[PDB]
Amino acid sequence: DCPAPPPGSPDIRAIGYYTDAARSVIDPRLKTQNDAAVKPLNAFAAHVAKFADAYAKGADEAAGRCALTWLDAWARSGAMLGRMAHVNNDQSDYMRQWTHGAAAMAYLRTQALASEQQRTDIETWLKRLSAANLAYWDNPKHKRNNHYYWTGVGIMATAVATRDDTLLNTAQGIYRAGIDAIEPDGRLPMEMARKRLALHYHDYATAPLVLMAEMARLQGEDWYTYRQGALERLAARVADGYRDPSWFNTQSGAVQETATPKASSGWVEFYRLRSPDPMRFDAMHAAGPFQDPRMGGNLTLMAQEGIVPLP
Ligand SMILES: [Cl-]
Numbered sequence: 520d521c522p523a524p525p526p527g528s529p530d531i532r533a534i535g536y537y538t539d540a541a542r543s544v545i546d547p548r549l550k551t552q553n554d555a556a557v558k559p560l561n562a563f564a565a566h567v568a569k570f571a572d573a574y575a576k577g578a579d580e581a582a583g584r585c586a587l588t589w590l591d592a593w594a595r596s597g598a599m600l601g602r603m604a605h606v607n608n609d610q611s612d613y614m615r616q617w618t619h620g621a622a623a624m625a626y627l628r629t630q631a632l633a634s635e636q637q638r639t640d641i642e643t644w645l646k647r648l649s650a651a652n653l654a655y656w657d658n659p660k661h662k663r664n665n666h667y668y669w670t671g672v673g674i675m676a677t678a679v680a681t682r683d684d685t686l687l688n689t690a691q692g693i694y695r696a697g698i699d700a701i702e703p704d705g706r707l708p709m710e711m712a713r714k715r716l717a718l719h720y721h722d723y724a725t726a727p728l729v730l731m732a733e734m735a736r737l738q739g740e741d742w743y744t745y746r747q748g749a750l751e752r753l754a755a756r757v758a759d760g761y762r763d764p765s766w767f768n769t770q771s772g773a774v775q776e777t778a779t780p781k782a783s784s785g786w787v788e789f790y791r792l793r794s795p796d797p798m799r800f801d802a803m804h805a806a807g808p809f810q811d812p813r814m815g816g817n818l819t820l821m822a823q824e825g826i827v828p829l830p
Contacts, residue, residue, distance in 0.1 A: 575817075580632060616655075624673075674693065697728045707724050750790075
């Protein structure tokens, strides 16, 4: 039931796989190469989320403890705190952002079961990852698109799990940077620049923003009041776009790739409970249930049961 914690190397060597300026067309050879290079990272995320979801079913404290054993093993090896090797882009940094998010979400969900040593080990590691991922964004040449918002997932989950007001403020700034970037017509310009993937990337940018706001409810706060309505305009564009892509087609200059909502689209499971117009999200909700390790696991269940199971 609990496989051995897998190796948590300090180092990452991921491979970018888009061929065009708009990062909208995939080179399948490079995608296959990247998949193999980052398999340990994706496997770690998938398993800690699987264990957290199993813990959330109840009567399975062993599953929660399994997630903590895996997290503690990576914390003790200094996983991801070494070299972010750069081959053709910053894919290694993006992988550290997403994997920190998965790890921090799993810790947030399972930490009630942590030993004293596991809390110290894991929290120290998650704070070191927060600082390292934040520092990446100090260079203004790193464009603060959806990768920046995704960085906020791990920072926010670490902030809540450690009750760190400084990290909570940092995460709030990242969330608000995304909200502030929404234009009156609902677009996020850096995601609209992704041609046939413009809808996909508006969905993918919405995901971490919603998840951050949902984690803020764990501290009693309602982040949807910040620039209230702006996130709704973006979310409504996404839902509309799955029905009729004509606005994304015109504004992006490309016919959108045909796709069903999946995985991280499960932000809708939370957001439909917050929106003033919930029923407009029914068609996206019907594509569920939604699971994404980078968001903590089963979004459909967490929206009903809460992100953190209670003991
Ligand atoms: Cl290298």
